[PDB]
C-alpha cells in the first residue's frame, strides 16, 4: 500500500535524524516533586513525579549507575535512551526529558494513569477476543513501525503495556530494545515470553517479537500464558517442544493465528515470511480490524480505566518508598558520557 510505504519511509527519515543527534540533559531532579513509586527493578525504579513549574505529572525512571555497571546493562541503558528519544508513534510512551547526575540516570516519560494491562487482565480474568484483538492490533502496528526502523523491542509482556485515558495501549520499557541490521545474540526477556531461538543461544532477529506477540495474545485471551512452570528450565523445555494446548473457548481463527505466531521454526513464523507483517494483518482473526481507524485512535475502546485525574495512582500498586540519593561524588562518569 502506497500509504503504508510513504508512512514508513517518512517514519524512518524522522527516526534517523534524531538517532544521529540525540538530545541530552534536558531537565534536573530538583525540577520535580516526588510523589509515589510506580514500580521497581534490580537497578532502577519508576516514580510518579510532578514538575514544579508546570504542574504536569510524569513517570520518572531512575537508574543507579553503579548497579547498571554491576549488572552489565550499560549498552542496554544507552540503547533505551537513544531509541526512546528518537521514536514517535501513537502507542509508544513518549520520553519528555532525560538527564543524569552524580549517581543516577533519569528518563522522564509521560505518565499513563490507567496502569498496567497486567492488572486489568488479572482483575477481569481474561479478555474477550474483540478486547484482546483491539490491543493486539496496536502491538502489530507498533512492531510494524519499530521493525521498519531496524529496531527489535524484546520485552513484550502485559506489565509493559499501559492503558491510557482513552483505553489505548502505551508501550513502555525500552531497556532491551536495540537497533539491529541482521541478527543479535543477547539473552534477555522474561522466560514465559522468550522465543525458542533465544533459549537456544542462536543469533535471532525481529521474529522473536512476533513470537512474543503470540504469547501475549494467548495470555490475553486465556488469562494465563501458554508456557508456564515453577522453574525457568521447565518453561524453556515447554517453549522449545513445538506443542501448545488451546482452551476450547478459543475461536478456530485465533488458534490458527497462534499456531503461526508460536511457530518454533523462525523461518516459518508469521511476521518473518516474505510478506512480513501483512501475513498477520490479513489473517482471518483480524478480519474485523480497521487498521487505519486503530492507528488514528478512532475506535471506541473496549475498556476505559477508572481514575480521578492525571495524578491518580490507584491503578498502580504499592511499593516500599525509598530515598533518591545523589552522591556528593560523581560515579561512573566515563561509562555514561553518551547519556
Active site residues: 155
Sign of the CA dihedral running 193, 196, 198, 201? positive
Candidates 173, 192, 197, 219; binder of ligand A1JEK (CB under 6 A) is: 173
Q: Is 242:264 a contact under the CB 8 Å cutoff?
A: yes
Q: How far is the CB of 172 from ligand A1JEK (least distance, A)?
A: 4
Interface region with ligand A1JEK, contact rule CB under 6 A, candidates 70-78, 104-112, 205-213, 298-306: 104-112
57 binds ligand A1JEK (CB under 6 A): no
172 binds ligand A1JEK (CB under 6 A): yes
* Angstrom distance (rounded) from CA 37 to CA 161: 17
Q: How far is the CB of 110 from ligand A1JEK (least distance, A)?
A: 7
* Angstrom distance (rounded) from CA 23 to CA 338: 10
Interface region with ligand A1JEK, contact rule CB under 6 A, candidates 136-144, 157-165, 280-288, 327-335: 157-165
**Nearer to ligand A1JEK among residue 290 and residue 321 (C-beta):** 321
In this structure, the chain runs to a length of 339
Q: Which residue is nearest to ligand A1JEK (CB)?
A: 39
38 binds ligand A1JEK (CB under 6 A): yes
Query: Cell digits for 112?
Result: 499513563
* DSSP conformation letters of 265-324: SGGGSTTSSTTTTHHHHTSGGGTT--HHHHHTT-SPPS-----SSTT--TTS--------
**Nearer to ligand A1JEK among residue 107 and residue 239 (C-beta):** 107
Q: How far is the CB of 41 from ligand A1JEK (least distance, A)?
A: 8
115 annotated as a binding-site residue: yes
Query: Cell digits for 324?
Result: 533518591
**Nearer to ligand A1JEK among residue 160 and residue 289 (C-beta):** 160
Residues 116-135 that bind ligand A1JEK (CB under 6 A): 116
* Angstrom distance (rounded) from CA 100 to CA 107: 9
* Angstrom distance (rounded) from CA 180 to CA 147: 9
**Cell 493486539, located at residue:** 136
Residues 245-304 that bind ligand A1JEK (CB under 6 A): none
Query: Cell digits for 154?
Result: 524484546
3-state secondary structure at position 176? coil
Q: Give me the residues that bind ligand A1JEK (CB under 6 A), please.
A: 38-39, 46, 59, 61, 93, 109, 111-112, 116, 159-160, 162, 172-173
Binding residue numbers for ATP: 38-46, 61, 110-116, 157-160
Amino acid at each position: 500500500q502506497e500509504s503504508v510505504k510513504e508512512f514508513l519511509a517518512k517514519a524512518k527519515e524522522e527516526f534517523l535524524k534524531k538517532w544521529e543527534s540525540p538530545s541530552q540533559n534536558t531537565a534536573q531532579l530538583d525540577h520535580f516533586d516526588r510523589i509515589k513509586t510506580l514500580g521497581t527493578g534490580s537497578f532502577g525504579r519508576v516514580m510518579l513525579v510532578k514538575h514544579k513549574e508546570t504542574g504536569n505529572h510524569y513517570a520518572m525512571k531512575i537508574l543507579d549507575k553503579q548497579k547498571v555497571v554491576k549488572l552489565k546493562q550499560i549498552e542496554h541503558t544507552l540503547n533505551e535512551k537513544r531509541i526512546l528519544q528518537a521514536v514517535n508513534f501513537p502507542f509508544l510512551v513518549k520520553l519528555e526529558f532525560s538527564f543524569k547526575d552524580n549517581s543516577n540516570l533519569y528518563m522522564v516519560m509521560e505518565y499513563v494513569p490507567g496502569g498496567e494491562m497486567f492488572s486489568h487482565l488479572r482483575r477481569i480474568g481474561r479478555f474477550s477476543e474483540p478486547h484482546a484483538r483491539f490491543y493486539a492490533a496496536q502491538i502489530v502496528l507498533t512492531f510494524e513501525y519499530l521493525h521498519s526502523l531496524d529496531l527489535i523491542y524484546r520485552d513484550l509482556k502485559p506489565e509493559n503495556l499501559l492503558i491510557d485515558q482513552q483505553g489505548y495501549i502505551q508501550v513502555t520499557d525500552f531497556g532491551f530494545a536495540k537497533r539491529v541490521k541482521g541478527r543479535t545474540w543477547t539473552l534477555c526477556g522474561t522466560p514465559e515470553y522468550l522465543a525458542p531461538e533465544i533459549i537456544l543461544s542462536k543469533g535471532y532477529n525481529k521474529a522473536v517479537d512476533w513470537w512474543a506477540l503470540g504469547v501475549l495474545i494467548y495470555e490475553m485471551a486465556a488469562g494465563y500464558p501458554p508456557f508456564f512452570a515453577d522453574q525457568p528450565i521447565q518453561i524453556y523445555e515447554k517453549i522449545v517442544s513445538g506443542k501448545v494446548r488451546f482452551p476450547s473457548h478459543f475461536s478456530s481463527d485465533l488458534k490458527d493465528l497462534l499456531r503461526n505466531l508460536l511457530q518454533v521454526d523462525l523461518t516459518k513464523r508469521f511476521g518473518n515470511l516474505k510478506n512480513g507483517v501483512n501475513d498477520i494483518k490479513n489473517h482471518k482473526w483480524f478480519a474485523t480490524t480497521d487498521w487505519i481507524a486503530i492507528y488514528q485512535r478512532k475506535v471506541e475502546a473496549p475498556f476505559i480505566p477508572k481514575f480521578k485525574g492525571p495524578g491518580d495512582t490507584s491503578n498502580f500498586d504499592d511499593y516500599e518508598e525509598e530515598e533518591i540519593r545523589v552522591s556528593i561524588n560523581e560515579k561512573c562518569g566515563k561509562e555514561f558520557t553518551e547519556f
